Design a protein around this ligand. Structure first.
Ligand SMILES: [Cl-]
Ligand SMILES: [Cl-]
Ligand SMILES: [Cl-]
Ligand code: NA
Ligand code: NA
Ligand code: NA
Length: 129
């Protein structure tokens, strides 16, 4: 599913991501924009052989199981395919774990490089929330 911007903001809020670990909703929407262009089915193979899955491009090295990432972990206790669902619950629950791991949203390199420090409120501007 490719979410609209305000549609995704609303879904993220529904699932408790707004201000989670102090990160406002615009941060999460901005991260999703640059990770997946709001497409729940996004996948991307990394040079290390891991793969990133879903709206927030969660990586199989640590967070989910895809059966093809040697030496990896599955700390969200989910198949990586669950992160591709139209329903964002699994991605949100895993993102909560990731952002709590110590480096905040810097875990998402694209957030650090493209969202951090910017007017992230613009990503939720105009939305009925
Ligand atoms: Cl957009
Ligand atoms: Cl915001
Ligand atoms: Cl933080
Ligand atoms: Na992989
Ligand atoms: Na894994
Ligand atoms: Na594996």
């Amino acid at each position: 599913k490719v979410f609209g911007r305000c549609e995704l903001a609303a879904a993220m809020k529904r699932h408790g991501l707004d201000n989670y670990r102090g990160y406002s909703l615009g941060n999460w929407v901005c991260a999703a924009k640059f990770e997946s262009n709001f497409n729940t089915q996004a996948t991307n193979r990394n040079t290390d052989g891991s793969t990133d899955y879903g709206i927030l491009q969660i990586n199989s090295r640590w967070w989910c199981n895809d059966g093809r990432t040697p030496g990896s972990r599955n700390l969200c206790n989910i198949p990586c395919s669950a992160l591709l669902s139209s329903d964002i619950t699994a991605s949100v629950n895993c993102a909560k774990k990731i952002v709590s791991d110590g480096n905040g949203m810097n875990a998402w390199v694209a957030w650090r490089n493209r969202c951090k420090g910017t007017d992230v409120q613009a990503w939720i501007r105009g939305c009925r929330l």
